[PDB]
Design a protein around this nucleic acid. Structure first.
Ligand code: K
Ligand code: K
Ligand code: MG
Ligand code: MG
Ligand code: MG
Ligand code: MG
Ligand code: MG
Ligand code: MG
Ligand code: MG
Ligand code: MG
Ligand code: MG
Ligand code: MG
Ligand code: MG
Ligand code: MG
Ligand code: MG
Ligand code: MG
Ligand code: MG
Ligand code: MG
Ligand code: MG
Ligand code: MG
Lengths: 101, 325, 140, 132, 197, 49, 567, 235
RNA sequence: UUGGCGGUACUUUAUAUCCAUCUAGAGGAGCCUGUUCUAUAAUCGAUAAACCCCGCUCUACCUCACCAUCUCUUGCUAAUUCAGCCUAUAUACCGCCAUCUUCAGCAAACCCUAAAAAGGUAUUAAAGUAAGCAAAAGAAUCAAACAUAAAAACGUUAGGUCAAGGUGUAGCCAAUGAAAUGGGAAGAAAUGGGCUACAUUUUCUUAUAAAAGAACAUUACUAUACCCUUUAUGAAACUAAAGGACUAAGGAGGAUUUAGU
């Protein structure tokens, strides 16, 4: 069991983007240039569109791995601000201290 | 019916055992560090403990310690009565037997001097011991009124004719005052390959840092970062700041300075050089002049530096607008 | 042990090869840690260890780095009230010189195996070698 | 008022350990860090994975030694080695601890694919820093 | 069912002339029953002393150096001397090294804590050679300096080739050596279009 | 892998090698709730037909 | 660089006072509990492998991955049979082999031999394992051997070895006869099994039996097969039966071992010692001297595992030293154990504690007390936790060296090793302390030791409903209290003689009276008379008269004393 | 998820709502209030629903000289162990409700006339087991404060006596009733009057007095007359 | 008698603060943004001081919790007449905070009173005493000080948050659960905050903030709007940036009000 159904959908989006990464790279390369005929580029523009929507890598959201919070996350630890503060304020993060200056 | 851990008062047998364990500890710590147990000292102990138990805690009271039990264990007032229950001191029932025993002695001294019957400044540059120091001498806690009364009685003793016994007595309650030397430390005078004399000093203003190299003999040629000072400092106010050290001592056109200022802006770099030149120029002026410079602000580093911004407000002191109601 | 002592302790087999050895002109070891005292103790162990094997060593302290970030103190609203956190990194650089490749492997293993917890190393070997045989002689 | 990791005052009958007594602002001042790895140092990677592993390792030891932990565990990472240092009360028989050590080491070494060792220091009872 | 009783600490049986390296052969956590020292740690309470070693989490939180003592390190390095090889005496100076070994190859290792020993930065290699060390005619040196662009530093006369494109360090190292050979051989070659400069 | 952690620890709780205070708390709240007659209905037999 | 820590338990055991093994039983129990926890984890990992499959370790660690032992090839082919054979499944492989024969599909002779190896080696039984065997005439191994269309030397050889392993000596020899008739050639391993067969079989005449085993050796040269170490070790192990007649044959073998170039291992000497120094040796008057020559031969040599009896050598060598009462030889044997990494061949749990127990007991008997205490601190507890008899030997050594001041210290050590409530040990400690008089300081120290041993009796009495205070401890504890400024306690202990109905000894009774005279307390003197009357001891009347002259008795005391005198 | 699970201490703290604001201000007519329970009370380390048997943890490591191996209880055997645990669990619960009767006072809902035991031992182990304490009044007075508004304290009047002529009384005030009992009980032992009894059963003579506005008229009576007085005077 | 109050007096007083003093702003214009209102088939929460660029260090799909339509019924897990629920109650709570507050008190154990509802000080001293928490000290801003941060008890506002997560009670279980597709509009209307400009201490250009040459009121100053092109990210431009034109309003802002030592 994952934290919630929103984290479950994100996990599937992350696993389907990994499968279609090479494919979406090869097809999209044919479009990001000015050396190939525009007819081929217009056709590659539709082959990429036909791929499943969950393959698109901009539909991935970074969520707290422990609470599935969509916003407030710190990318280095993958935790929300609320969860990070609980581990930091208890001495459980190695080298994290309060900032007094 | 209050249930908290009571004071673990330390008996003499307890502290005695704590001193035997420490004495056996030193022999082990010496054996670990490969040193001779006989010569191993308190300073070596602190060095050994710091290596074997590295701690980076900012507060040093919280770091590992293997100290002699006397330093760590607070020395406590012992039992004030015997097995039969009779207090050892006749002033026991006052509650401040040691404060009142001392006030008994000084009042008896005062009476003999007054009955029995020169300059009183036998000691100068001394202060009366502070309340915290007195409390330690008596091994008990005093109030502010208790301290004030003790001093008034001691002052009365000095007023009266005092034999050498009284002077030694009041001496025990006088702590030597150390008047900090607020005088400049003159720089050395090195010599170049050519043989000319020169002194060097650093200066810091805001984030700028400078390293001046004043020469004893010159025509007033100042070069900043290998450039002239009129070119490097196109602003008049910055050049005026470089003039202040020499103009003050009427030494314009008599020294040749080579500066190296990195960091900060135009004004902070001129100010940093000003201090660096004033500190280097000390080696070539009389001590009366060096004091003249200090009292004109030329030798004091400026502590004013940019303040940090605080979260929840626009600036270091600027606060977000209090929204209308 | 007072009376019971090993007689002929077994020692690892070190066989000298016929391949020439690497020659390191310099070998910079940058240790990093959150604690200054740990670096002081490790610096003492590393300098003492180098001196005992004949290696030439120097030490300096690169400037420390402090990374600060701000977070929201409350779980909901109260924007203006924040909590700030920092991570402090301290550095000690051990610059070794004129090391053969065998001396640099045994030394690095010995000091890397004894690297305390919370300490990260960054070895930067600088090898010196002859010119390529093709480059030595111009050929058209 | 700040509530984070602060054991509050009652009537002077609440035992607190040294770790519990000190609020977050004393971290790096009076009390150190329970976990020591290289993942939060400057220019270092895999902080998220070290932090997630620690969270699990603490819940695992609490359940595997229920009521037998005198204080929070200390995690020490050196190379790929993991070292767990736990103060444990002397409640269980001695042979039971030998079982749980062999079990918890093997299970956590085959779960994270690293050598994991357990270090247990037994105390007669919880150590009380102060009564608050 | 009587409770089990703990034995007295083994520090009591430890002599003051023991072989301490044997007590702590390798890095271990602080064991109050094995460290024969009355060490105390902890910010003391008012009218209190720092906490004792037994049951001290703060002492356990320290990365101690008990296994690494001046007596151990000297005994350790004595064994490790057999491994070391002697630096050639002739190369007593940095300038002497540049004469016989003009090529400097920079490689970096990284040591961190975790299950994976992989760091992306370990593949990068940097070759540094001085053009004076290379046998270059006046024509060749001008051609070498124009091709390399900013890799050449006029002040130091050092050519810097940094290769990280290949996955492994042995490939990146071999590539930089290749780049030097092509640049050197190409510099000597004279092309007809060069006469139009 | 939230599935591996939840499944692995659940299996250990049933083998007696792990104790889940959170689960034991919930398991007893269900027991008491069922006695009170507030237990989960069977699927397809809910209040609405 | 590092050496053994003398004040620490073995590294296996957890380094905590609560978790250190006090006794030898706990040592094995603590390790068995550890092995049990390791097996509980491996069971879970191998039973729920899906949770232990994510690999985050670079480089990859193969030994930290879940194991799979069940065949995953479903199709019935020679390849599938080969998999089962590789996994060592015996019954499943037989079923798939028979199914392959039922279909008639070709099976390679090499593959058919891999099946016989598995069946012959495990004797038709599934491999032993833990989770939640004579040769059978009608078995899969023999059946499959007959079904084999084409036979090779290896096939016969596998049968000969498996039979001998599973105690089928008679059949194995018959199988070998077939191999000779087919004109095939055996290997060294098969010749070693055949030699093991002739020896185990009981032959009426040794001379015939010996000539038979030699015939196997002669056929090893006809077939150009060279012997190995195991071959000679097998012959010597068989010779240990005939101690009297195996001496000359045994030495000849070792000379032939060197000429061939095979190097005798620790096991090879273990067998020669057994054959020359029998444990049940009546003729102890003039023992053999070979043990001295062997140790000289092996002085300074380092040995590695090369046989299955290498561990046995050291335990046997120390035993022979104790029998001969030669402590110089015991040092040579221990000195050999310390060279290189010979320590690894001391033995397992049964033989590790016999070697050191035998060693330390010899030291205490034949070594100076000063050195004896050096060995004591080194070996115990770091090497072995001794049984109580070891301490009785140590205490007796202290008595022979006139150093009884250390007896209290030996007692404190004994309590750590679970001898606190040992009756035999407690009786020895008190006996030696109170056997003779001592200076005042020593008597006071002994009195404190006597008090501690009293608490053990007292606490044991309280816990147990039925408890008996042995008579001798009562006398020793009472005497020590009188001699060591604890006379008041000794008067209370006088009552315990009546509570437990133990007969006070004549010496003890008069000792109490002597102390009473110095004290001058007539009351205390009469107390002794009371106890004498209880047990109707004849001396009690004489003691009562002695009190009359020793002290002035008040008229009230006269009436009270007279009543006791009448009683 | 396994990572959203909290400890028992945190689960009970929240569910009980003891530290909540409402309880502190007494804004609920407490009834049917959750009762805390320890769930680790009867759980043995090594015992699971699956019924596995772990040598060295929940079963003997060695049995009759045989080194045990892992095993599991049968479905019937496990249903028995599970049943036995339920019986122990219920047994504890019934004992929780079981209580020991204490005699009431003048009325069932009043504290007047209730024995609260002897005073506590003195400074040098001076026990007062021969003294009995009785309550004469418990009042909930109020002091208005700016911080707390109406603030409540418990004022207790107690009397003590050894039944042999020595008796005393004191008032104890506190915010908690239990504390007011301790303060008054130990204070009254410091104010012991000695009362003269004629022949050990009555006063020496009639006694009429006025204390403030209270009037008392006592009369000496013969044996067997009994105490015919105000209930406080009887106490 | 205690507390609260007094358009009852008499003394202290606030330190960027109540009045006075000082500087730059808000209030007017154009935009960006929040809220309210209107309004939509179409979230939720915050919403005097202590909400209003607030949860968001962030909404084209996703995010998403909303609306419409279509679809699934053991439906994430080892097992479970179970899974799941952003369904109600922050007036059941934990967790984490706001506020008086850098305010000086809080709580507990004792002792005293011609009774005590409470109160308990006098220093040339008259009933108060000995300890905890806060403050102080200490540590941080890598000499030193100062300063700044941090710290700040117990209570007050049933203050905020069941939508970070968890959880008590009640409710849904072919639906209040799960998944897919397409939508989630609009003002220009009030108001909060911010940005930019209104210019000469200015405008543009080169330099570099030195200096110089031009511009300087009808379009000079002057839009980060609308519109038109190009580029960046993406599958999708509805987004952002860079140019181009096009010009509007703006001529230093009433009552009043914010911040700074
Ligand atoms: K709350
Ligand atoms: K607006
Ligand atoms: Mg949920
Ligand atoms: Mg996104
Ligand atoms: Mg500003
Ligand atoms: Mg009633
Ligand atoms: Mg103001
Ligand atoms: Mg406006
Ligand atoms: Mg609300
Ligand atoms: Mg959307
Ligand atoms: Mg949608
Ligand atoms: Mg919903
Ligand atoms: Mg609320
Ligand atoms: Mg403070
Ligand atoms: Mg509310
Ligand atoms: Mg919820
Ligand atoms: Mg809600
Ligand atoms: Mg300008
Ligand atoms: Mg214009
Ligand atoms: Mg595009």
């Amino acid at each position: 069991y994952y934290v919630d159904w929103r984290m479950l959908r994100d996990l599937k989006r992350r696993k389907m983007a990994y499968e279609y990464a090479d494919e979406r790279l090869r097809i999209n390369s044919l479009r990001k240039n000015t050396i190939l005929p525009k007819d081929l580029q217009e056709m590659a523009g539709d082959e990429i569109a036909a791929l499943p929507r969950d393959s698109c890598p901009v539909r991935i959201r970074n969520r707290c791995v422990m609470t599935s919070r969509p916003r407030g996350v710190k990318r280095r630890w993958r935790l929300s601000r609320i969860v990070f503060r609980h581990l930091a304020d208890h001495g459980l993060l190695s080298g994290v201290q309060r900032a007094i200056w | 019916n209050v249930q908290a851990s009571r004071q673990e008062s330390y008996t003499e047998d307890f502290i005695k055992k704590q001193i035997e364990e420490f004495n056996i500890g030193k022999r082990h710590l010496a054996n670990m560090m490969g040193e001779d147990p006989e010569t191993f000292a308190e300073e070596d102990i602190d060095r050994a403990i710091a290596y074997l138990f590295p701690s980076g805690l900012f507060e040093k009271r919280a770091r590992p310690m293997m100290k002699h039990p006397e330093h760590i264990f607070p020395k406590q007032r012992a039992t004030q009565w015997g097995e039969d229950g009779r207090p050892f001191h006749f002033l026991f029932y006052t509650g401040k037997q040691s404060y009142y025993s001392l006030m008994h002695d000084v009042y008896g001294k005062v009476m003999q001097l007054e009955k029995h019957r020169a300059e009183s400044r036998d000691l100068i540059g001394s202060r009366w011991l502070i309340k915290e120091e007195l409390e330690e001498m008596l091994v008990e806690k005093l109030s502010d009124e208790d301290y004030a009364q003790f001093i008034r009685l001691l002052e009365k003793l000095l007023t009266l004719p005092c034999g050498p016994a009284e002077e030694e007595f009041v001496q025990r309650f006088r702590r030597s005052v150390t008047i900090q030397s607020k005088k400049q430390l003159i720089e050395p005078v090195q010599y170049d390959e050519q043989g000319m004399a020169f002194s060097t000093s650093e200066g810091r203003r805001k984030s700028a840092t400078a390293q001046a190299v004043v020469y004893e003999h010159g025509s007033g040629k100042i070069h900043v970062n290998g450039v002239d000072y009129l070119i490097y400092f196109p602003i008049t106010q910055d050049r005026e700041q470089l003039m202040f050290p020499f103009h003050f001592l009427d030494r314009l056109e008599r020294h040749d300075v080579t500066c190296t200022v990195s960091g900060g802006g135009r004004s902070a770099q001129a100010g940093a050089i000003r201090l660096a030149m004033a500190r280097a120029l000390c080696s070539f002026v009389t001590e009366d002049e060096v004091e003249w410079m200090r009292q004109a602000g030329l030798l004091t580093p400026d502590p004013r530096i940019r303040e940090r911004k605080k979260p929840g407000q626009e600036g270091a002191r600027r606060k977000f607008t209090w929204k209308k109601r | 042990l007072h009376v019971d002592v090993p007689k002929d302790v077994t020692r690892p087999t070190i066989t000298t090869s016929d391949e020439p050895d690497t020659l390191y002109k310099r070998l910079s070891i940058l240790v990093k840690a959150h604690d200054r005292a740990v670096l002081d103790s490790y610096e003492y162990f590393a300098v003492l260890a180098a001196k005992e094997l004949g290696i030439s060593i120097k030490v300096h302290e690169p400037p420390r780095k402090i990374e600060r970030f701000t977070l929201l103190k409350s779980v909901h609203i109260f924007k203006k009230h924040r909590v700030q956190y920092e991570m402090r990194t301290l550095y000690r650089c051990l610059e070794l010189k004129h090391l053969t490749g065998s001396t640099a492997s045994v030394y690095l293993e010995y000091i890397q195996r004894n690297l305390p917890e919370g300490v990260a190393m960054e070895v930067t070997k600088t090898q010196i070698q002859q010119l390529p045989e093709h480059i030595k002689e111009p050929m058209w | 008022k700040n509530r984070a990791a602060r054991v509050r005052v009652a009537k002077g009958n609440k035992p607190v350990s040294y770790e519990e007594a000190h609020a977050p602002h004393y971290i790096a001042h009076r009390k150190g860090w329970l976990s020591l790895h290289t993942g939060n140092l400057d220019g270092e990677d895999h902080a998220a994975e070290r932090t997630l592993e620690d969270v699990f390792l603490r819940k695992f030891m609490m359940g595997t030694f229920p009521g037998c932990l005198a204080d929070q565990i200390v995690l020490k990472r050196r190379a790929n080695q993991v070292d767990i240092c736990a103060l444990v009360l002397r409640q269980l028989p001695a042979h039971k601890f030998y079982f749980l050590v062999g079990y918890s080491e093997t299970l956590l070494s085959h779960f994270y694919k690293c050598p994991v060792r357990l270090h247990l220091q037994t105390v007669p009872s919880k150590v009380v820093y102060k009564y608050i | 069912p009587m409770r089990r009783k703990a034995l007295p600490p083994r520090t009591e049986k430890m002599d003051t002339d023991q072989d301490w390296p044997s007590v702590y052969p390798t890095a271990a956590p602080f064991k109050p029953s094995a460290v024969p020292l009355p060490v105390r740690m902890g910010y003391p309470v008012k009218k209190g002393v720092p906490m004792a070693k037994e049951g001290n989490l703060e002492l356990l939180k320290i990365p101690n150096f008990l296994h690494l003592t001046p007596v151990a390190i000297k005994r350790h390095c004595a064994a490790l001397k057999d491994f070391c090889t002697e630096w050639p005496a002739a190369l007593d100076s940095d300038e002497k090294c540049e004469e016989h070994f003009p090529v400097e190859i920079d490689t970096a290792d990284y040591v961190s804590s975790g299950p994976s020993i992989r760091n992306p930065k370990a593949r990068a290699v940097t070759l540094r050679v001085k053009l004076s060390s290379l046998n270059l005619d006046n024509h060749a040196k001008k051609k070498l300096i124009k091709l390399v662009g900013e890799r050449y530093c006029k002040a130091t006369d050092v050519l810097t080739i940094t290769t990280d494109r290949c996955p492994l360090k042995r490939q990146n190292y071999d590539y930089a050596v290749y780049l030097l050979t092509v640049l050197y051989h190409e510099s000597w070659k004279t092309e007809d279009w060069e006469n139009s400069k | 892998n939230h599935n591996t952690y939840f499944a692995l620890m659940g299996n250990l709780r049933f083998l007696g090698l792990y104790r889940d205070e959170h689960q034991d708390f919930k398991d007893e709240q269900r027991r008491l709730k069922k006695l009170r007659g507030k237990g989960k209905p069977r699927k397809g037999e809910g209040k609405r037909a | 660089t590092v050496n053994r820590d003398p004040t620490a338990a073995p590294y296996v055991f957890h380094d905590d006072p609560y978790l250190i093994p006090t006794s030898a039983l706990e040592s094995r129990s603590f390790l068995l509990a550890k092995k049990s926890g390791e097996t509980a984890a491996k069971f879970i990992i191998n039973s729920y492998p899906k949770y232990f499959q994510k690999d985050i370790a670079e480089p990859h660690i193969p030994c930290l991955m879940p194991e799979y032992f069940e065949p995953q090839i479903e199709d019935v082919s020679e390849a599938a049979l080969e998999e089962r054979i590789r996994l060592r499944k015996v019954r499943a492989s037989v079923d798939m082999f028979d199914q392959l024969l039922q279909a008639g599909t070709t099976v390679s002779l090499e593959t058919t031999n891999s099946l016989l190896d598995l069946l012959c080696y495990y004797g038709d039984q599934e491999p032993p394992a833990d989770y939640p065997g004579p040769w059978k005439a009608q078995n899969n191994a023999e059946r499959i051997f007959a079904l084999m269309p084409e036979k090779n030397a290896r096939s016969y050889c596998t049968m000969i070895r498996g039979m001998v392993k599973h105690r089928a000596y008679a059949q194995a020899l018959n199988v070998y006869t077939e191999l000779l008739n087919n004109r095939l050639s055996a290997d060294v391993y098969t010749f070693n099994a055949l030699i093991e067969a002739k020896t185990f079989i009981l032959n009426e005449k040794f001379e015939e039996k010996w000539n038979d085993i030699l015939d196997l050796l002669k056929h090893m040269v006809a077939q150009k097969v060279k012997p190995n170490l195991q071959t000679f070790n097998t012959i010597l192990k068989g010779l240990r039966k005939c101690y009297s007649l195996g001496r000359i044959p045994a030495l000849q073998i070792l000379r032939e071992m060197k000429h061939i170039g095979i190097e005798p291992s620790l096991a090879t000497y273990h067998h020669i010692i057994h054959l020359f120094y029998p444990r049940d040796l009546s003729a102890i008057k003039m023992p053999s001297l070979i043990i001295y020559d062997i140790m000289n031969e092996l002085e300074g040599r380092t040995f590695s595992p090369q046989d299955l009896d290498d561990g046995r050598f050291f335990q046997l060598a120390m035993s022979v030293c104790s029998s001969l009462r030669d402590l110089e030889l015991a040092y040579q044997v221990h000195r050999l154990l310390n060279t290189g990494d010979n320590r690894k061949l001391v033995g397992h749990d049964p033989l590790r504690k016999v070697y050191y127990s035998k060693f330390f007991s010899l030291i205490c008997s034949l070594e100076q007390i000063d050195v004896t205490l050096k060995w004591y601190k080194d070996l115990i507890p770091s090497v072995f936790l001794p049984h109580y008899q070891i301490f009785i030997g140590l205490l007796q050594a202290l008595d022979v060296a006139n150093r009884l001041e250390l007896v209290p210290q030996i007692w404190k050590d004994s309590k750590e090793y679970s001898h606190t409530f040992r009756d035999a040990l407690r009786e020895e400690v008190l006996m030696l302390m109170a056997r003779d008089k001592h200076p005042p300081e020593l008597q006071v120290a002994f009195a404190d030791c006597a008090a501690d041993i009293k608490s053990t009796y007292e606490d044991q009495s309280a816990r147990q409903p039925a408890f008996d205070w042995p008579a001798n401890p009562l006398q020793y504890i009472a005497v020590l209290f009188l001699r060591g400024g604890r006379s008041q306690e000794a008067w209370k202990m006088l009552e315990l003689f009546k509570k437990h109905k133990k007969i006070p000894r004549n010496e003890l009774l008069e000792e109490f009276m002597d102390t009473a005279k110095a004290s001058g307390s007539t009351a205390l003197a009469i107390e002794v008379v009371k106890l004498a009357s209880a047990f109707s001891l004849p001396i009690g009347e004489s003691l009562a008269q002695r009190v009359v002259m020793d002290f002035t008795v008040d008229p009230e005391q006269k009436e009270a004393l007279g009543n006791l005198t009448e009683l | 998820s396994f990572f959203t699970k909290l400890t028992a201490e945190e689960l009970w703290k929240g569910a009980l709502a003891e530290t909540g604001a409402g309880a502190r201000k007494g804004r609920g007519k407490r009834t049917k209030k959750k009762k805390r329970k320890d769930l680790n009370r009867g759980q043995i380390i090594g015992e699971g629903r699956s019924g596995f048997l772990w040598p060295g943890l929940n079963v003997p490591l060695i049995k009759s000289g045989v080194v045990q191996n892992i095993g599991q209880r049968s479905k019937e055997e496990q249903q028995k162990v599970e049943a036995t645990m339920v019986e122990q669990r219920e047994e504890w619960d019934r004992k929780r409700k079981i209580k020991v009767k204490r005699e009431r006072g003048w009325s069932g809902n009043t504290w007047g006339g209730v024995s609260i035991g002897p005073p506590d031992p003195g400074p040098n182990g001076e026990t007062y087991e021969d003294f009995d304490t009785r309550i004469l009044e418990v009042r909930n007075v109020f002091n208005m404060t700016a911080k707390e508004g109406r603030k409540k304290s418990v004022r207790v009047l107690v009397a003590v006596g050894n039944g042999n002529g020595a008796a005393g009384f004191a008032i104890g005030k506190a915010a908690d009733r239990g504390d007011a009992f301790r303060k008054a009980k130990n204070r009254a032992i410091h104010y012991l009057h000695y009362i003269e009894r004629y022949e050990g059963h009555t006063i020496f003579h009639d006694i009429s007095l006025r204390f403030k506005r209270t009037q008392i008229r006592m009369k000496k009576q013969p044996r067997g007359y009994g105490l015919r007085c105000h209930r406080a005077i009887i106490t």
